[PDB]
Amino acid sequence: MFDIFTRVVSQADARGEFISSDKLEALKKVVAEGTKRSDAVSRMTNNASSIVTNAARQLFADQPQLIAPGGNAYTNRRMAACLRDMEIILRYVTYATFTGDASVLNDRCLNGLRETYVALGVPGASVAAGVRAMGKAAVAIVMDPAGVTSGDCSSLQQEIELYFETAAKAVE
Amino acid sequence: MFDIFTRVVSQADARGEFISSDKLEALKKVVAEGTKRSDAVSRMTNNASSIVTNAARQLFADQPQLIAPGGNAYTNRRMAACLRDMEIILRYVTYATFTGDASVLNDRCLNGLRETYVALGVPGASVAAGVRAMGKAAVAIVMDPAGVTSGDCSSLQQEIELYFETAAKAVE
Amino acid sequence: MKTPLTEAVALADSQGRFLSNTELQYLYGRLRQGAFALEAAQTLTAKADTLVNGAAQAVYSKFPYTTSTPGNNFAADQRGKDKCARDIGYYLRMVTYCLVAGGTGPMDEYLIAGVDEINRTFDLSPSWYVEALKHIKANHGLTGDAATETNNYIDYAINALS
Amino acid sequence: MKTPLTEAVALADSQGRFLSNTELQYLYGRLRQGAFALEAAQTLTAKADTLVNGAAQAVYSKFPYTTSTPGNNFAADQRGKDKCARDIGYYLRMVTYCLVAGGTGPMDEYLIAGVDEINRTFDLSPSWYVEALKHIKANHGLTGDAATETNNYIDYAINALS
Amino acid sequence: MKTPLTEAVALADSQGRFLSNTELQYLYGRLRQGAFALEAAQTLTAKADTLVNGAAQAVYSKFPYTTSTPGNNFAADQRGKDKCARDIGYYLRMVTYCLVAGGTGPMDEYLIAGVDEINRTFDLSPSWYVEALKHIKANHGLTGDAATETNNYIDYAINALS
Amino acid sequence: MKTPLTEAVALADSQGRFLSNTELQYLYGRLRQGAFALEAAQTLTAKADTLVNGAAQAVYSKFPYTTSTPGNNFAADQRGKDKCARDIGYYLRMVTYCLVAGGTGPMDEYLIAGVDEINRTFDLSPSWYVEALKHIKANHGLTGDAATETNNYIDYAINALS
Ligand SMILES: CCC1=C(C)/C(=C/C2=NC(=C\c3[nH]c(/C=C4\NC(=O)[C@H](C)[C@H]4CC)c(C)c3CCC(=O)O)/C(CCC(=O)O)=C2C)NC1=O
Ligand SMILES: CCC1=C(C)/C(=C/C2=NC(=C\c3[nH]c(/C=C4\NC(=O)[C@H](C)[C@H]4CC)c(C)c3CCC(=O)O)/C(CCC(=O)O)=C2C)NC1=O
Ligand SMILES: CCC1=C(C)/C(=C/C2=NC(=C\c3[nH]c(/C=C4\NC(=O)[C@H](C)[C@H]4CC)c(C)c3CCC(=O)O)/C(CCC(=O)O)=C2C)NC1=O
Ligand SMILES: CCC1=C(C)/C(=C/C2=NC(=C\c3[nH]c(/C=C4\NC(=O)[C@H](C)[C@H]4CC)c(C)c3CCC(=O)O)/C(CCC(=O)O)=C2C)NC1=O
Ligand SMILES: CCC1=C(C)/C(=C/C2=NC(=C\c3[nH]c(/C=C4\NC(=O)[C@H](C)[C@H]4CC)c(C)c3CCC(=O)O)/C(CCC(=O)O)=C2C)NC1=O
Ligand SMILES: CCC1=C(C)/C(=C/C2=NC(=C\c3[nH]c(/C=C4\NC(=O)[C@H](C)[C@H]4CC)c(C)c3CCC(=O)O)/C(CCC(=O)O)=C2C)NC1=O
Ligand SMILES: CCC1=C(C)/C(=C/C2=NC(=C\c3[nH]c(/C=C4\NC(=O)[C@H](C)[C@H]4CC)c(C)c3CCC(=O)O)/C(CCC(=O)O)=C2C)NC1=O
Structure with a gap:
């Protein structure tokens, strides 16, 4: 919904004045690095499903009480529900880093993630640790170049790290 | 250049009487364990190449200077010569446990080797670490049993550790 | 949960009627099934360790x-063997629950959904x-109505599995 | 039928609006993709027989x-080898259509549905x-934007396949 | 030309002295070797054709x-695979010659020098x-002492190749 | 250590003769070489990083x-590809050194002997x-006389490797 261009537009409309020149220089920097947004989104959407399985792999090696009967992730239906939750969480991370604004992820996950997880009985600790490990693996596959022309990517690293910590403190 | 049989011979000659009975029990049990000894040597020289590359690969993982530029084993013929030296030290320690005596080892290869490595500029402690790791793999290759009758080779595990240790301490 | 009593209750709930005589016959059929299903679950629980052990070795x-080959699904080392044997033990325990419940509901909810x-x-x-369940249905060695009712549950799991 | 022109048309149909400038930018992006996608499909069609042959051999x-083992999925005799090589050739042809269409639609409709x-x-x-497509994406040997756009399509097929 | 007898003759010629007591033992130690070695050469001659076919299977x-991949070195077509059968048959035959002679000299002279x-x-x-000789040394199934001699044997082959 | 000047000194030195007119020509013929050679070394230094990345792309x-395939030699994981970048960077740097010195002696001393x-x-x-140096000699885009020198140059590299 809200893009960083539309973020600047909404600030300039709340002020009701024309946009400042230095903010337009910041937007010139943004459109200069839009190809690196493309590089990162393409890279992690290439490997996304394997990242989801590896995150569930570290979660289920870490906490065997979830696989254990009576656990919340025990049943086959609930296991598919778990992988559904992680897949759509990584999907909204990809949405947010494609848009550049966290408003998509916030306005479509922050609202009811905690709510569903306390209402169902879902332990929010496991989802928080899982989205943290998934974010570490996502930075790991994004940052290292494999046959890719070299450049700096620290701002993007900061951006997806912020997106995954907003997810982590969303579910808690 | 001395077999342990002619070690007993030369010691009894410097004494100057016949070989005593206690040395003959010892030599008979040498004959009963030399079976273990000789082909302990050949199973050590079975995987001698893979032992050499594994010890060198571990050494250049432990000390990244030796494949860094300016290091001692950096250029291609110096690296090949270092592989040649490690193969030579393994082959001579193999000869020494075939003779059953460390006299071939201290006599054929170790003695001027200390001065050679000092005068070349070659590090000696790196060689010491290499021969120690090579000796660990060496007994275990011989020690582990694949298609061989179970037997007590403890002396072999023992004596080959002594021979590798003399090699590494005489390199220094 | 596929239980013929509860399926009858769900039917009469959807109709909004009281208990009909169809449901009385349904209860009769459930008692007729259980009168050997309980003893069959008993001997299955007696045989279960040898069953899952022979089934794991037969699949291996x-x-x-x-x-x-070293892989993540496969049992290269012993932890994969443990997870594999845990899975077949899970399967046979679902079979026992499926038998004792009178319907495919424990199987359906606990395996077949995903x-x-x-x-x-x-x-x-x-x-x-599939071949594990084939070894189990070859290995239980029972006779009678209970044997083929269990075999029906096993090949139901096979058909829904493949 | 994931085609960015047609997806833009479907969007403006759902909105009920005329053509907006967003769609003009969408067309610009499609032309930017096609300007190397067509040449990449050309060299893929040149390489295709060696690609599917090496991929079949590499999977074998x-x-x-x-x-x-003699089985029905496996290539025990030569007819299974023919069906196997037909399948990988089908896969690579879907990759070429997926490239030339500008989106995942030929892949989606013709493979990914069932x-x-x-x-x-x-x-x-x-x-x-999966490992066949890994061998193909290792074997095409291209560089540039076209190479990684094709590689993106290939790993999309890998991810949806597994 | 490494057999124990010719090396004894070469030592005695280089020293200029006739064979001593130590030289005599050499041949009755060639009894510990040869009493199994000729048996193992015969059973390798019997095993030979399935050995080359399995080694070609393992290498492919x-x-x-x-x-x-199409190439002159690679066995894409028939004639490349014919060259492979020739090469592995040469390797197995040099192993048999090396086994009959008693030393590595036939193998070191006919294979290793170039x-x-x-x-x-x-x-x-x-x-x-390497794959071919490892498959041969796994597949030959030699018994007792004969098997061990060949293993030192076939490891020397791999060490010359690696 | 093959540069034309040190070989002139070695000839005079081996012979024991004093420097002569024949030796002198090499110095002003090293002008026909060096007047482009130092330019080509600078433009290779500029081209270097995209050359190694494209050569890694071509080899993969x-x-x-x-x-x-997983292995120590193969570049399956990251660290193998890092070793590949190191190896091809070493090859390109030895080409640059060989170009600046004027003879093959730096390349023959630092690469070829082991x-x-x-x-x-x-x-x-x-x-x-071979693939890496062929991709470099296709991709370097040298102009005129400098380009010709490299081909003689890079072909010597392939001939030492093959
Ligand atoms: C688009 C944004 C969006 C999100 C993120 C979302 C999540 C969501 N996750 C759910 C369940 C779930 N989520 C989990 C999660 C886990 N399993 C565990 O034990 C771990 C703690 C964690 C593993 C990752 C489980 C087991 C269920 C099923 C809960 C149940 O069966 O009641 C449900 C209940 C519905 C269902 O049964 O599928 C919703 C609505 N819904 C949305 O609309
Ligand atoms: C999806 C199909 C598709 C891809 C892949 C695509 C990629 C792409 N990445 C690019 C640049 C770039 N992309 C990167 C990004 C990176 N480099 C790194 O070292 C990091 C590991 C990584 C960031 C995570 C950098 C650093 C540049 C060049 C300079 C810059 O723009 O920052 C460029 C500009 C010119 C070029 O380098 O080719 C293109 C076209 N365009 C496409 O249509
Ligand atoms: C029979 C016993 C015997 C030994 C042991 C022996 C050693 C020996 N090692 C040498 C060199 C070498 N030795 C090494 C050693 C190593 N590289 C490292 O970085 C490590 C510190 C170490 C590996 C353990 C290297 C790099 C050279 C080459 C130095 C040079 O040739 O310039 C040389 C100089 C000749 C040459 O190979 O170029 C001799 C004579 N010679 C003998 O006759
Ligand atoms: C009550 C019914 C029920 C079943 C059956 C069930 C199975 C089940 N098996 C699993 C994994 C697994 N299953 C296997 C099994 C095998 N690999 C092999 O060598 C054998 C052929 C096979 C033994 C059957 C392995 C190796 C894993 C872990 C996959 C991996 O390690 O990444 C997982 C993923 C979580 C995990 O163990 O680590 C589930 C949920 N869960 C259930 O709730
Ligand atoms: C355009 C995209 C597309 C694809 C890919 C496709 C695949 C496809 N492969 C099939 C079968 C098959 N696929 C295989 C394949 C294999 N067994 C092996 O040895 C190899 C590992 C593997 C080669 C990939 C075999 C052996 C059959 C027949 C199964 C059997 O004989 O019963 C069938 C069933 C109908 C039939 O051939 O007899 C379909 C529909 N169809 C499509 O429309
Ligand atoms: C007696 C000892 C002996 C050895 C070791 C030997 C090796 C040898 N292998 C050759 C060819 C070959 N060897 C192979 C075999 C293989 N290449 C592959 O890629 C496969 C993996 C492998 C099958 C195992 C092939 C395909 C050629 C063909 C080269 C050509 O046609 O140019 C040639 C060229 C001769 C010719 O043109 O027929 C020699 C000399 N020849 C000998 O006489
Ligand atoms: C200055 C001249 C020079 C040359 C020629 C040279 C070659 C060389 N390449 C090496 C490793 C390597 N080189 C490669 C590169 C490749 N292998 C492949 O399979 C790829 C196709 C190819 C990428 C192009 C790899 C993967 C290793 C790793 C070996 C290992 O880790 O054991 C090593 C082992 C040293 C180490 O462990 O880092 C040497 C000595 N080194 C030099 O100093």
Whole structure:
């Protein structure tokens, strides 16, 4: 919904004045690095499903009480529900880093993630640790170049790290 | 250049009487364990190449200077010569446990080797670490049993550790 | 939960009627099934460890490569063997629950809902558990109505599995 | 039928609006993709026979047992080898259509809709075609924007396949 | 030309002295060797044809890019695979000659002295013949002492190649 | 240590003769060489980083079994590809040194003398560096006389490797 261009537009409309020149220089920097947004989104959407399985792999090696009967992730239906939750969480991370604004992820996950997880009985600790490990693996596959022309990517690293910590403190 | 049989011979000659009975029990049990000894040597020289590359690969993982530029084993013929030296030290320690005596080892290869490595500029402690790791793999290759009758080779595990240790301490 | 009493209750709930005589016959059929299903579950629980052990060993001899190649689904080392034997023990325990419940409901809810999806995302093969269940249905060695009712549950799991 | 022009048309149909400038930018992006996608499809069509032949050979060396055991999915005799090579040729042709269409639509409609279901009912394994596509994406040997756009399509097929 | 007898003759010739007591033992120690060695050469002659066919199977299954990629060195077509049967048959025959002679001299003379330039100029990766000799040493199934002698034997072959 | 000047000194030195007119010509013929050679070394220094990245791309596209098959020599994971960047960067830097010195002596001293045992013991197929140097000699885009020198140059590299 809200893009960083539309973020600047909404600030300039709340002020009701024309946009400042230095903010337009910041937007010139943004459109200069839009190809690196493309590089990162393409890279992690290439490997996304394997990242989801590896995150569930570290979660289920870490906490065997979830696989254990009576656990919340025990049943086959609930296991598919778990992988559904992680897949759509990584999907909204990809949405947010494609848009550049966290408003998509916030306005479509922050609202009811905690709510569903306390209402169902879902332990929010496991989802928080899982989205943290998934974010570490996502930075790991994004940052290292494999046959890719070299450049700096620290701002993007900061951006997806912020997106995954907003997810982590969303579910808690 | 001395077999342990002619070690007993030369010691009894410097004494100057016949070989005593206690040395003959010892030599008979040498004959009963030399079976273990000789082909302990050949199973050590079975995987001698893979032992050499594994010890060198571990050494250049432990000390990244030796494949860094300016290091001692950096250029291609110096690296090949270092592989040649490690193969030579393994082959001579193999000869020494075939003779059953460390006299071939201290006599054929170790003695001027200390001065050679000092005068070349070659590090000696790196060689010491290499021969120690090579000796660990060496007994275990011989020690582990694949298609061989179970037997007590403890002396072999023992004596080959002594021979590798003399090699590494005489390199220094 | 596929239970003929509860399925009858769900039917009469959807109709909004009181209890009809169809439901009385349904109860009669459930008692007729249980009168041997309980003893069959008893001897299955007696045999269960030898069943899952022979089934795991038979699947390992059935495909040598899962023992051979190092992989994440396959049992290269012993932890994969433990997870594999845990899975077949889970399967046989679902079979016992499916038998004692009178319907496919424990099987349906606890296995059949997402088995092929986790087999897809973990790159498992269902044919492993198919031939495992074939070894179990060859190994239980029972006779009578109870034997073929259990065999019906087992091949239901096979058909829904593949 | 994932085609960015047609997806833009479907969007403006759902909005009920005329053509907006967003769609003009969408057309610009499609032309930017096609300006190397067509030449990439050309060299892929040039390389295609060697690609599918090396991919079949590499999958056969990748798992020796499909050549070994007599089975119905596996290539015991030569007819299974023909069906296997037909399948990888089908895969690579879908990749070329997916490239030339500008989106995943030919892939989606022609493979992704029921691939895991026929793999379930025929007891195939998708990992065979996964490692086949890995060999193809290792073998095409291209550089530039076209190479990674094709590689993106290939790993999309890999991710949806597994 | 390394057999124990010719090396005893070479030692006595280089020293200029006739054979001593130590020289005599050499041949009755060639009894500990030869009393199994001639048996093992005969049973290798019997095992030979299935050994080369299985070694070709193992080399093609380990490296599928040989059977896939078109080239002169690679066995894409028939005549390349015929060259492979020739090469592995030569290796197995040199193993049999090396076993009958008692020393590595036939194998060291007929194979080892030029293998580095041939593998350099003709693009024959030696890891292929590593696979072939490892498959032979796994598949030959020799019994007792004969098997161990060959193993030291076949490891010398791999060490010359690697 | 092959530069034309040190070989003139070695000839005069081996002979024991004083410097002569024949030796002198080499110096102003090293002008026909060096007047482009230092330019070409600078433009190779500029071209260097995209040259190694494209050569790694070409080697991975020619041989997909390197990026696929797990091994120490093969570049399956990251650290193998880092070793590849190191190796091709070493090759390109020796080409630049060989270009600045005027003769093959830096390249013949720093690369060629041990490459046969390293490729034998460490399982590095030299056709990989054949691909790398052929991609470099196609991609460097040298102009006129400088380009001709490199071909004689880079062909000597391939001839030492093959
Ligand atoms: C688009 C934004 C969006 C999100 C993120 C979302 C999540 C969501 N996750 C759910 C369940 C779930 N989520 C989990 C999660 C886990 N399993 C565990 O034990 C771990 C703690 C964690 C593993 C990752 C489980 C087991 C269920 C099923 C709960 C149940 O069966 O009641 C449900 C209940 C519905 C269902 O049964 O599928 C919703 C609505 N819904 C949305 O609309
Ligand atoms: C999806 C199909 C598709 C891809 C892949 C695509 C990629 C792409 N990445 C690019 C640049 C770039 N992309 C990167 C990004 C990176 N480099 C790194 O070292 C990091 C590991 C990584 C960031 C995570 C950098 C650093 C540049 C060049 C300079 C810059 O723009 O920052 C460029 C500009 C010119 C070029 O380098 O080719 C393109 C076209 N365009 C497409 O249509
Ligand atoms: C029979 C016993 C015997 C031994 C042991 C022996 C050693 C020996 N090692 C040498 C060199 C070498 N030795 C090494 C050693 C190593 N590289 C490292 O970085 C490590 C510190 C160490 C590996 C353990 C290197 C790099 C050279 C080459 C130095 C040079 O040739 O310039 C040389 C100089 C000749 C040459 O190979 O170029 C001799 C004579 N010679 C003998 O006759
Ligand atoms: C009550 C019914 C029920 C079943 C059956 C069930 C199975 C089940 N098996 C799993 C994994 C697994 N399953 C296997 C099994 C095998 N690999 C092999 O060698 C054998 C052929 C096979 C033994 C059957 C392995 C190796 C894993 C872990 C996959 C991996 O390690 O990444 C997982 C993923 C979580 C995990 O163990 O680590 C589930 C949920 N869960 C259930 O709730
Ligand atoms: C355009 C996209 C597209 C694809 C890919 C496709 C695949 C496809 N492969 C099939 C079967 C098959 N696929 C295989 C394949 C294999 N067994 C092996 O040895 C190899 C590992 C593997 C080669 C990939 C075999 C053996 C069959 C027949 C199964 C059997 O004979 O019963 C079938 C069932 C109908 C039939 O051939 O007889 C379909 C529909 N169809 C499509 O429309
Ligand atoms: C007695 C000892 C002996 C050895 C070791 C030997 C090796 C040898 N192998 C050759 C060819 C060959 N050897 C192979 C075999 C293989 N290449 C591959 O890629 C496969 C993986 C492998 C099959 C195992 C092939 C395909 C050629 C063909 C080269 C050509 O046709 O140019 C040639 C060229 C001769 C010719 O043109 O027929 C020699 C000399 N020849 C000998 O006489
Ligand atoms: C200055 C001249 C010079 C040359 C020629 C040279 C070759 C060389 N390449 C090596 C490793 C390597 N080189 C490669 C590169 C490749 N292998 C492949 O399979 C790819 C196709 C290819 C990428 C192009 C790899 C993967 C290794 C790793 C070996 C290992 O980790 O054991 C090593 C082992 C040293 C180490 O462990 O880092 C040497 C000595 N080194 C030099 O100093």
